[PDB]
Design a protein around this ligand. Structure first.
Ligand SMILES: CCCCCC(=O)N[C@@H](CCO)C(=O)O
Ligand SMILES: [Zn+2]
Ligand SMILES: [Zn+2]
Length: 254
């Protein structure tokens, strides 16, 4: 019969930082205090091979806090990225080259999640169709996040990548946002919300936060709460300065 298989290791890998006004983590706050938020990628060691979740910020952000000057989000988003935080350099320091990866999973195509996608020209890049179409046609997305000739593996809805690695369709923060539900050998069930909730309070208290469609984001939180009720996972949020204070990071794993 079937026996649940698990991921060997889940690593949390810091991939630079990004400043956002605090009203992006709580839409009720009056703008004027920036927060220096973590940017994450995740590396999964699986029986099938290594899987990278998200790819950090684009090269244009390197030593360029002013990347969004001149744009509709000038002053609202300030990347904090050095040369060391380029995904290929991160990967090389951990022990991989792009072609070693089995899959890339793009949670969504915001610049802090897909800015490194162009480095992976052979690995299949798993992305929701509604996210891909949004980035193709909407000028809010950076071109770096929707390069045309990458090996996209477009999916629709929930999806099993390999045994132990699940994608949960969680639109709202972006049109085709997806979260991850992972079963690891050391820890059991893990929910990576990604940006379906920037912080614990966005999830527990349903505090509104930056996103394309807040009403959808709330329904995706409600779905994730159903999952949580059934699976009781450990939960990690997308851009949570408080939670970062307790998160085990590379070279530790869960
Ligand atoms: C004002 C807070 C915005 C939060 C996330 C977002 O829309 N990111 C966009 C910004 C560029 O339009 C992206 O990364 O594509
Ligand atoms: Zn986002
Ligand atoms: Zn994000």
């Amino acid at each position: 019969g079937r026996i649940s298989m698990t991921v060997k290791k889940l690593y949390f890998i810091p991939a630079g930082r990004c400043m956002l006004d605090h009203s992006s983590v709580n839409s009720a706050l009056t703008p004027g205090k920036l927060l220096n938020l973590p940017v994450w990628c995740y590396l999964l060691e699986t029986e099938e091979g290594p899987i990278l979740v998200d790819t950090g910020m684009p090269e244009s952000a390197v030593n360029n806090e002013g990347l969004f000057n001149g744009t509709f989000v000038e002053g609202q988003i300030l990347p904090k990225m050095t040369e060391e935080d380029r995904i290929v350099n991160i990967l090389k320091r951990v022990g991989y080259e792009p072609d070693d990866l089995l899959y890339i999973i793009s949670s969504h195509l915001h610049f802090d999640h897909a800015g490194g996608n162009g480095a992976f020209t052979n690995t299949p890049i798993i992305v929701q169709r509604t996210e891909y179409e949004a980035a193709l046609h909407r000028e809010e997305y950076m071109k770096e996040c929707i390069l045309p000739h990458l090996n996209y593996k477009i999916i629709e809805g929930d999806y099993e990548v390999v045994p132990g690695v699940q994608l949960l369709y969680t639109p709202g923060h972006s049109p085709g946002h997806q979260s991850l539900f992972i079963e690891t050998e050391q820890s059991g069930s893990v929910l990576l919300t990604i940006d379906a909730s920037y912080t614990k309070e966005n999830f527990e208290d349903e505090v509104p936060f930056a996103g394309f469609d807040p009403e959808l984001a709330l329904s995706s939180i409600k779905r994730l709460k159903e999952v949580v009720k059934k699976e009781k996972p450990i939960i990690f949020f997308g851009h949570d300065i408080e939670q970062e204070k307790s998160c085990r990071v590379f070279p530790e794993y869960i």
